[PDB]
Design a protein around this nucleic acid. Structure first.
Lengths: 129, 123, 88, 150, 218
RNA sequence: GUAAAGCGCACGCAGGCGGUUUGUUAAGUCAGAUGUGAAAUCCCCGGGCUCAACCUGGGAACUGCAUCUGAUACUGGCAAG
RNA sequence: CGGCCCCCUGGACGAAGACUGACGCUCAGGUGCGAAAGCGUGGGGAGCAAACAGGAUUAGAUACCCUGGUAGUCCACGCCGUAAACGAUGUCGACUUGGAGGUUGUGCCCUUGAGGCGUGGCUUCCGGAGCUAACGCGUUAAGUCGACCGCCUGGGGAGUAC
RNA sequence: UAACCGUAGGGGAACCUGCGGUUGGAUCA
């Protein structure tokens, strides 16, 4: 959005899923693609690309196993006016461990397990189940 | 509300109103007994019950219920208020202790001796 | 609103170049005119409120621009407020 | 073996020309200590006749929960109508921690260790299903690897 | 540029605020159903049918509508499955218990003409009894082969076959319906935003359904 | 929305929030460490009164404040866009 | 906010474009605008009409009905700030099937036409997913989200007392 | 005498009447 560009990413992804869409598109961003990269390895998204050397536009591909979709849970937490910063011993564990939790570390964007395995903390980004 | 709207004017409490004039945070209070009434209950019930105005030690006057199947108080006898209001009797949110001070206590009662005025019957 | 022979006129007086109808120095100044000119209009009628709403708009809108200059080039601010006899 | 359980039964009425008639309802949950359940709800002019229907209707239209070691894989969360129910799995040792409906629906689904709570309306007719919908969503730790493995 | 060029749009401005993310864009009185939002639905649904068909399940095609009745069997009956091209009885999915009872007198009614057991009773009687077939063999004649609730229900228009879908979501029987602009897709777990009408739209997809189902079980 | 609850409507100061890129900073933040966080409570493991209550060793914790050395993804500051 | 005309003036929208370069969103307090009724001074006053007066109705009729009729309704200027001031739904932004229609701009099409195909603004009705306690809302959301603000915490007493 | 809100006046009392708004008005107005 014009105020919360990251929160929009999640919404556009979840809104697409519900509508059984194929691919979601929206303006890119260092953090955005960075986040989009994680869900990739996590198998939450098929692939992802962008267009524009001056006018970048993210391109994500939704995913679904059977009748229902894959990403059946995606919400934010560390939003503006109410940001969240956890330690290496406070990091959340989405769905008892199954779901992932994106968190920006001094090393870069990671997941609840990722950063933990490292032994460092960062500003939580969102919960993906 | 929102964090901002909370930081300003948070969540207010609620001064618990303890329905009891003879407060002073006490289990009971001593009285003097102004008189002995026999007022009638509300609309749902009938039969005249026994009550009595009490001049609590703290001045705070108030009518207390005189439960039990047998009254025996006087217009000067000293009783002890306890609590527990009564529906049928409005304004009467108290009861005179049975078997204490210058009062008496139920007679011939063999059940629920603790309550009322009775302590181990004729055996 | 404003006459072309005036709008397209002033633009060529504050623009740091040519046909820069965007430049704050320009737009901002362009606002003072339509404002000062209307003050003579509002002097009459008065009760005409729906027109003042727009008047106030361009006024605050003008200020929103002045604050910007101060937060982009201190000089340009004090360098323009004079040419327009602003601040009063 | 299927284990039925009578949640509760209300009377309910109906005013008409002549006067006013009544017809008890009753709700029943059935299942096995494996991972299958499904409540039932039937009416009747007789206390026993009612439960008879609900039971039949119960055995059918069941469900299959992704239970693990006598408990839930993770703290699921379901809601329905005005009933907000949140269930959470606990290690062996803790009995079934639930009020009414929930406590029952689980004592037949194969649940042994949990600790829920009814937030919204305590209506049995709903809290009973608000729970079933919870487990009905319970994502098992399996398949997830396939849901995004390839 | 493919066959999906026959159900472009339908149902004027009556629409339904819910059916929006599937609207190509209103134009010339009525709107259009974004086919690009239909392509995934075009198969996603069929995929499950193809998958379930392999499980040797059941499929009931509901299409009481005239322009779909006579032209629905060839996709269901011929393909040997289940369908109801008439007044969907009240309970043929929930109160099936008592409904099946009607099927019996229908079957045993059939056997009457089967053998010489038809030349029984006055010539008039046979007539009074034969009428039952007309109704029975019609309202159930295409469901008699269902010895138990199905496993998935594919209904044409989501509006007309309203009650049909209802009972379904009450028994746990998945529903694959080809809704429409004025349709209420909230009851369909597998929406197929297409022209609920159009003599061609119905046939193509309807027949296309049995296609995947046909070899669904390999 | 109809249950209690959108100010009759605007403009707007303070306040809260802030599109995209690169560099930079290292304040927030994260990591490590050093202080300090009284003892006793609480908790874990273990001791002694015949058991328990009780008494008791060591640890855990005291979620905090400060300082130092870093890390630079995100928020913030500065510069050019 | 409705006759026609002139003068002064605000906002909205489209299109080729050209320009500035985050200058933005919200906003307690603050300032301003506010139906009608009402108030002050001075005008005006056809119709209508609180008050008031007759006639009728009725058990009664301080009403409905009928015959009259003053303030008021109208103008100027100042005050009062309320309304079921209602979409009973705060402002701003991004997403999410469809159908029929209205109104206004623009591109295009043997522009040969009433016309046909798009592409923006505002707006009606139906309705899908979803949401909802239900009614119902449904791309102008009461759906999915984000930023800021106002507000609610049982009924009576009471929007009353001080 | 559709009701209610505002505002005004009047009357034993609910309430009546005027002006504006509302549908939280029945019947095809």
């Amino acid at each position: 959005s014009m105020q919360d560009p990251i929160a929009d990413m999640l919404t556009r992804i979840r809104n697409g899923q519900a509508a059984n869409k194929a691919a979601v598109t929206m303006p890119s961003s260092k953090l955005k693609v960075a986040i989009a990269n994680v869900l990739k390895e996590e198998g939450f998204i098929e692939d992802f690309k962008v267009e524009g050397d001056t006018k970048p536009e993210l391109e994500l591909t939704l995913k679904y196993f059977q009748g229902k979709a894959v990403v059946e849970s995606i919400q934010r937490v560390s939003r503006p006016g109410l940001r969240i910063y956890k330690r290496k011993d406070e990091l959340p564990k989405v769905m008892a461990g199954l779901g992932i939790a994106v968190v920006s570390t001094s090393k870069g964007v990671m997941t609840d397990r990722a950063a933990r395995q490292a032994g460092l903390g960062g500003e939580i980004i969102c919960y993906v189940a | 509300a929102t964090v901002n709207q909370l930081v300003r004017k948070p969540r207010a409490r609620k001064v618990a109103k303890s329905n009891v004039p003879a407060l002073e945070a006490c289990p009971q209070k001593r009285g003097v007994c102004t008189r002995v009434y026999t007022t009638t209950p509300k609309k749902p019930n009938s039969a005249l019950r026994k009550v009595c105005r009490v001049r609590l030690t703290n001045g705070f006057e108030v009518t207390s219920y005189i439960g039990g199947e047998g009254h025996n108080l006087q217009e000067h006898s000293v009783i002890l208020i306890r609590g527990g209001r009564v529906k049928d009797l409005p304004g009467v949110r108290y009861h005179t202790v049975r078997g204490a001070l210058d009062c008496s206590g139920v007679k011939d009662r063999k059940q629920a001796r603790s309550k009322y005025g009775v302590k181990r019957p004729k055996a | 609103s404003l006459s072309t022979e005036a709008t397209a006129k002033i633009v060529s007086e504050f623009g740091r170049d040519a046909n820069d109808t965007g430049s704050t120095e320009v737009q901002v100044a362009l606002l003072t005119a339509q404002i000062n000119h209307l003050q003579g209009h509002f002097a009459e009628h008065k009760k005409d409120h729906h027109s003042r709403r727009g008047l106030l708009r361009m006024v605050s809108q003008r200020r929103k621009l002045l604050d910007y200059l101060k937060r982009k080039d201190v000089a340009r601010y004090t360098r323009l407020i004079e040419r327009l006899g602003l601040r009063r | 073996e299927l284990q039925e359980k009578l949640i509760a039964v209300n009377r309910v009425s109906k005013t008409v020309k002549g006067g006013r008639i009544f017809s008890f309802t009753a709700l029943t949950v059935v299942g096995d200590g494996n991972g299958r359940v499904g409540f039932g709800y039937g009416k009747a002019r007789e206390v026993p006749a009612a439960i008879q229907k609900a039971m039949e209707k119960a055995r059918r239209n069941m469900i299959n929960v992704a239970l693990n070691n006598g408990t839930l894989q993770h703290p699921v969360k379901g809601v329905h109508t005005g009933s907000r129910v949140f269930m959470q799995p606990a290690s062996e040792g803790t009995g079934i921690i639930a009020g009414g409906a929930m406590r029952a629906v689980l004592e037949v689904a194969g649940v042994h260790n949990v600790l829920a709570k009814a937030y919204g309306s305590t209506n049995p007719i709903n809290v009973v299903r608000a729970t079933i919908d919870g487990l009905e969503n319970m994502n098992s730790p399996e398949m997830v690897a396939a849901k995004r493995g390839k | 540029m493919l066959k999906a060029g026959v159900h472009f749009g339908h149902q004027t401005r009556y629409w339904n605020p819910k059916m929006k993310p599937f609207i190509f864009g209103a134009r010339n009185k009525v709107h259009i159903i974004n086919l690009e939002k239909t392509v995934p639905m075009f198969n996603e649904a069929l995929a499950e049918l193809n998958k379930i068909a392999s499980r040797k399940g059941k499929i009931l095609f509901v299409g009481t509508k005239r322009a779909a009745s006579e032209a629905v069997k060839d996709a269901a009956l011929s393909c040997d499955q289940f369908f109801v091209n008439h007044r969907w009885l009240g309970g043929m999915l929930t109160n099936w218990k008592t409904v099946r009872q009607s099927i019996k007198r229908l079957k045993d009614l059939e056997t009457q003409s089967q053998d010489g057991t038809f030349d029984k009773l006055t010539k008039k009687e046979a007539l009074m009894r034969t009428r039952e077939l007309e109704k029975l063999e019609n309202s159930l004649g295409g469901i008699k082969d269902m010895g138990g609730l199905p496993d998935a229900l594919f209904v044409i228009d989501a509006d007309h076959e309203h009650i049909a879908i209802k009972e379904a979501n009450n028994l746990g029987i998945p529903v694959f319906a080809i809704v429409d602009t004025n349709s209420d897709p909230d009851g369909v777990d597998f929406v197929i935003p297409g022209n609920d009408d159009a003599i061609r739209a119905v046939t193509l997809y309807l027949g296309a359904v049995a296609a995947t189902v046909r070899e669904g079980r390999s």
